[PDB]
């Protein structure tokens, strides 16, 4: 911690400054601002840049073994920056998840700009504890100075309140919203993949019918086709216009499959193949639109904007788990819930490591643009 922590901050600073500067350059030149996701990623890069600008202060502070020579105003500003980085990151990740859900399940720049304004104001307003509380504190008569978090008797429950604000308002609600959005995305992708797989089975068996000689192979292919069509009729796209032309189209399709099976069972092969040939008119008339929609939805997964956001959101909330656990334990200790000396020493000796690893996303967010680009 005496030398391990300041080295990681130095690594995060140089790589993050070099990295997050190229992301701004790339987004402003190559991945031009034509979508909401680009705007949100640019704002995320700017927030990371601000935090990395204030990072070397804390790097030096931890290197000198918790002595703060940068002043009082800098002590509160370099803490407001950290709080702002956390809140801006969580808010922008929620906005990105909502944008992905809207773009996938429900296929405006003004809305994005207003949302960015609201996010950069809400993060600053939620970082007010670090502005109205953080100050330099002299440890007793020793010449030691620390960037403490003062609170008077009127401002009671401030440690517990700050911990709860970090846990539920800063982390838990964003995590629940992101999980809901990605669960809805997964449901839509599963429906689309079910439809696409069933129709691929149907088309493969239709091609088998085309290259068939006896009625047995035709009959087996028609059986598989009917099963696939019945399965596909149940894969109704998520959101009468709908639920009445999709199902009617598949009813027509299964009726044609039944006619082909009826012809095949009698021993006729040419008429069965003719009915199988006619089976694609129903596709071109009723089901082609939904097949195109399903392929479009499945095509929004392989783009290199979904994997970047998926990696950024997953890594961020994975790297903040260790710090949220110890922060919650700290609140319990000061609430009097747990008074164990062994556990108390664990929290204090591991909190710097958790807070150091909780801001590695500001370093390796640009790395995702190259690893998944």
């Amino acid at each position: 911690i005496f030398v391990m922590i300041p080295t990681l901050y130095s690594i995060i600073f140089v790589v993050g400054i070099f990295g997050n500067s190229l992301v701004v350059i790339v987004i402003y030149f190559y991945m031009k601002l034509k979508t909401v996701a680009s705007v949100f990623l640019l704002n995320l890069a700017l927030a990371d840049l601000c935090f990395l600008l204030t990072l070397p202060l804390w790097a030096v502070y931890t290197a000198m073994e918790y002595r703060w020579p940068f002043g009082n105003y800098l002590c509160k500003i370099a803490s407001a920056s950290v709080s702002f980085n956390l809140y801006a990151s969580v808010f922008l990740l929620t906005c990105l998840s909502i944008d992905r859900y809207l773009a996938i399940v429900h296929p405006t720049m003004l809305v994005a700009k207003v949302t960015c304004i609201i996010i950069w104001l809400l993060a600053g307003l939620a970082s007010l504890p670090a502005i109205i509380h953080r100050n330099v504190f002299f440890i007793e008569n020793t010449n030691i100075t620390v960037c403490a978090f003062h609170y008077e008797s009127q401002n009671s429950t401030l440690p517990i309140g700050l911990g709860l604000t970090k846990n539920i308002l800063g982390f838990l609600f964003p995590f629940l919203i992101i999980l809901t959005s990605y669960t809805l995305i997964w449901k839509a992708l599963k429906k689309a993949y079910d439809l696409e797989d069933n129709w691929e089975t149907l088309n493969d068996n239709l091609k088998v019918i085309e290259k068939a000689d006896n009625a047995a192979q035709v009959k087996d292919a028609l059986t598989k086709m009917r099963a696939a069509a019945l399965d596909a009729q149940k894969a109704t796209p998520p959101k009468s216009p709908e639920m009445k032309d999709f199902r009617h189209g598949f009813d027509i399709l299964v009726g044609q499959i039944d006619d082909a099976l009826k012809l095949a069972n009698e021993g006729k092969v040419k008429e069965a193949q003719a009915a199988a040939e006619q089976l694609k008119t129903t596709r071109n008339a009723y089901i082609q639109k939904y097949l195109e929609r399903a392929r479009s939805t499945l095509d929004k997964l392989n783009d290199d904007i979904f994997k970047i956001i998926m990696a950024i959101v997953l890594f961020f909330f994975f790297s903040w788990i260790p710090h949220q656990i110890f922060t919650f334990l700290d609140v319990l200790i000061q609430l009097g819930i747990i008074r164990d000396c062994r556990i108390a020493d664990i929290v204090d000796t591991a909190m710097p490591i958790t807070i150091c690893i909780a801001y590695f996303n500001n370093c390796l967010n640009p790395l995702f643009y190259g690893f998944l680009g």
Partner: antibody, heavy 122, light 109 residues
Framework: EVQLVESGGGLVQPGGSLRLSCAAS????????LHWVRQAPGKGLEWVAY????????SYADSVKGRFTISADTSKNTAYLQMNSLRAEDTAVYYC?????????????????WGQGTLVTV | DIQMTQSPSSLSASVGDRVTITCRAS??????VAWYQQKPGKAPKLLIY???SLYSGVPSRFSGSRSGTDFTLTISSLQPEDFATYYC??????????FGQGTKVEIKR
């Protein structure tokens, strides 16, 4: 008041001919496909043959194909089953279920109403 | 020629017990699997017309399910009148009908 009844079951020498009726009520044969399901004594249910009055299409199980013949009469609401060259494996209780027509819920309700069943022995 | 196989040949259970009968299809037959209940000496009775859609007039304790090609029938409260042979039928097409081998649910002593 929907009901399907069977007749024609009895003792017949092997290799003989037997006629099984499925006089129905409460519907018409033109609305449903009348299937014939047998069940050997102390065994499971086995599908035998079916007829679709609307389409005129008849199918038979691979173990009864050719030997058995199934017909229907719209006026009488009867689905006859002509069995010829009966063997020892044809001793069973022959039921006569009904099955709806695609598309819709009547098709998904498979064999919703069964006949009382008739016993034939060789 | 889809083949349906019922795993429990016999199911001895007591009144009030929860019984589950599993029936598996060789191919995919969609949700076109029905469940019956044949008392000894009479015709079967439909219970679940789709894979999991309950029929009308039967008690709501019966409940089916589908997990691909595996179909299960469940009776929550094994009432004294729920002791009979239960068959699974695959009805993907008129000429493709195949029944299960039956699951004689008995009284546990």
């Amino acid at each position: 008041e929907v009901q399907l009844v069977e007749s024609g079951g009895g003792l017949v020498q092997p290799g003989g001919s037997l006629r099984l009726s499925c006089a129905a009520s409460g519907f018409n044969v033109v609305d449903f496909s009348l299937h014939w399901v047998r069940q050997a004594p102390g065994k499971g249910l086995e599908w035998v043959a079916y007829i679709s009055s609307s389409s005129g299409s008849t199918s038979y199980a691979d173990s009864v194909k050719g030997r058995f013949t199934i017909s229907a009469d719209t006026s009488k609401n009867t689905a006859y089953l002509q069995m010829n060259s009966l063997r020892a494996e044809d001793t069973a209780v022959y039921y006569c279920a009904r099955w709806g027509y695609w598309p819709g819920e009547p098709w998904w309700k498979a064999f919703d109403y069964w006949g009382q069943g008739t016993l034939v022995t060789v | 020629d889809i083949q349906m196989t019922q795993s429990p040949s016999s199911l001895s259970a007591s009144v009030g017990d929860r019984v589950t009968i599993t029936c598996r299809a060789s191919q995919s037959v969609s949700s076109a699997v029905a469940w019956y209940q044949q008392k000894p000496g009479k015709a079967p009775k439909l219970l679940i017309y789709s894979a999991s859609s309950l029929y009308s007039g039967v008690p709501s304790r019966f409940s089916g399910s589908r997990s691909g090609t595996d179909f299960t029938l469940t009776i929550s409260s094994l009432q004294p009148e729920d002791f009979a042979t239960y068959y699974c039928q695959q009805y993907l097409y008129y000429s493709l009908v195949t029944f299960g081998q039956g699951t004689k649910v008995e009284i546990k002593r």
